[PDB]
Amino acid sequence: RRRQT
Amino acid sequence: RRRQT
Amino acid sequence: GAMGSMERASLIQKAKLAEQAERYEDMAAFMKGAVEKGEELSCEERNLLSVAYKNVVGGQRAAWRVLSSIEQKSNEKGPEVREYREKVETELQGVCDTVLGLLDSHLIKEAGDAESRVFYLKMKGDYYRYLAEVATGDDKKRIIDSARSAYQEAMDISKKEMPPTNPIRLGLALNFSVFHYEIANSPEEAISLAKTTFDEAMADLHTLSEDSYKDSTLIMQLLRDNLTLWT
Amino acid sequence: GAMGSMERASLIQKAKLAEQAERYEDMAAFMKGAVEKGEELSCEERNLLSVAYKNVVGGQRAAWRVLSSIEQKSNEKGPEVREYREKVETELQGVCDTVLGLLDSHLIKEAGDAESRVFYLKMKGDYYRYLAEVATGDDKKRIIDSARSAYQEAMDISKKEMPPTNPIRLGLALNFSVFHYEIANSPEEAISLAKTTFDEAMADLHTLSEDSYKDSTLIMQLLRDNLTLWT
Ligand SMILES: N=C(N)c1cc(-c2ccccc2)c(CNC(=O)c2cccc3c2OCC3)s1
Ligand SMILES: N=C(N)c1cc(-c2ccccc2)c(CNC(=O)c2cccc3c2OCC3)s1
């Protein structure tokens, strides 16, 4: 899972 | 559902 | 230009990179450049060309449908919805004209093999079909009949020269069937074509290797999906 | 130009149509045109500007990451991978420079309210951050420190002038935290900021209407997601 912005 | 091509 | 100074092999390589990057506008520009080198295209190269423009025009068509629905509701608010729908429509028509231009100058005439000629005539049908989706004026009928003629010549060649499981033949039949259903107002023609195509492919699956079986059944499923929707 | 001849209101209306059509490049061009009229932007208009360029640069960044991974594997094949990665990178830098240009000429200086100034300083941090993602040369350090300075000034203003549940304040903290984690090599700073921001918002949820509660908890979930990934 990719970190969120 | 949309027909396929 | 603007791709005229790049090597053909480099354009193909960059098309494949653009596909992995989901940069389909770049991909289509690279493949246009490759076509314009003047040499015939291989099967993989034809597929790259088709995938690139399919995705480009697909985004345009999806946008057009959204805007057209908004425009129609607004006619049941100023010129802006019509203006912007027209802008997208014009860009879409330009892409279709570009593809048809590549086919006419000179992919189709230089396609010796049946398999290559069928591939390009099918594309010709598709891009006249996309033009028909947005056509409203005096040329709608000419555009529709041009799509039919291209599809039918492709069908005639595919039936003589390709087996009924060939995936390009199946994709041609799928799209000609959709043309009949939603462009030509011929839903029984559409259903009849999808059914005969599906059944004739089913009956020749026994002849296929494991790899070819997968190729064929993938496209047969699309025919079944449309029959399910339509009946 | 090229949007100089269109009415401001028409540009805003067409930005909203482009968003519904998922035509984010058009949306960004329309909103650039709206900014260039020279009037301050409303909250909705600021959100339209931010969403448009986020999606444009998001696609470019995603493509760049794909190409950079391919380039790196190819260094573990000719100049084509590097050339095409550089092409995407240059286009990405141009978009970032365009956004930073709008902020400097003259959105930030004309933003009287704290809420407007915070919004634009946060965007300034983001677009220097996107430049830092691809920077490799002598200006990487200047770019990183410029992002930090913009984010920190935004934090300072947001803490004095906005409640800890304000969604723009929470989105600023989320992105400054990610900056710390993956740009500045300061993962403990990143974790500390995400945690304090989350906890201070939690403690003021009791003050919110039903609508504001939904706004705040939506962004708090993103902070939690990153803490979950990082610890
Ligand atoms: N880069 C690409 N996209 C492709 C490269 C090759 C290729 C061909 C020959 C030799 C090497 C590669 C492709 C062959 N078509 C497919 O697999 C395919 C699969 C599902 C559906 C459709 C398909 O075609 C149109 C509709 S697609
Ligand atoms: N005669 C055949 N049956 C094929 C020969 C080659 C071929 C391969 C390498 C080199 C030259 C030709 C094929 C490559 N696969 C496709 O094109 C393909 C595969 C899956 C699905 C679809 C496809 O096309 C549209 C839809 S299929």
Ligand SMILES: N=C(N)c1cc(-c2ccccc2)c(CNC(=O)c2cccc3c2OCC3)s1
């Ligand atoms: N057209 C649009 N996309 C928007 C119009 C308005 C708007 C503002 C004021 C008045 C009217 C409309 C928006 C307010 N932001 C959101 O809802 C939002 C929701 C989830 C996540 C984020 C959000 O912002 C950035 C991150 S976004």
Ligand SMILES: N=C(N)c1cc(-c2ccccc2)c(CNC(=O)c2cccc3c2OCC3)s1
């Ligand atoms: N002071 C506040 N709390 C807000 C005032 C207004 C406002 C509305 C209309 C007119 C003027 C201001 C808001 C509009 N919503 C957003 O911007 C928003 C909503 C959900 C999520 C996010 C959002 O932004 C980034 C992330 S939030």
Ligand SMILES: [Cl-]
């Ligand atoms: Cl327009």
Ligand SMILES: [Cl-]
């Ligand atoms: Cl390139």
Ligand SMILES: [Mg+2]
């Ligand atoms: Mg050469």
Ligand SMILES: [Mg+2]
């Ligand atoms: Mg028109």
Ligand SMILES: [Mg+2]
């Ligand atoms: Mg005016």
Ligand SMILES: [Mg+2]
């Ligand atoms: Mg560079």
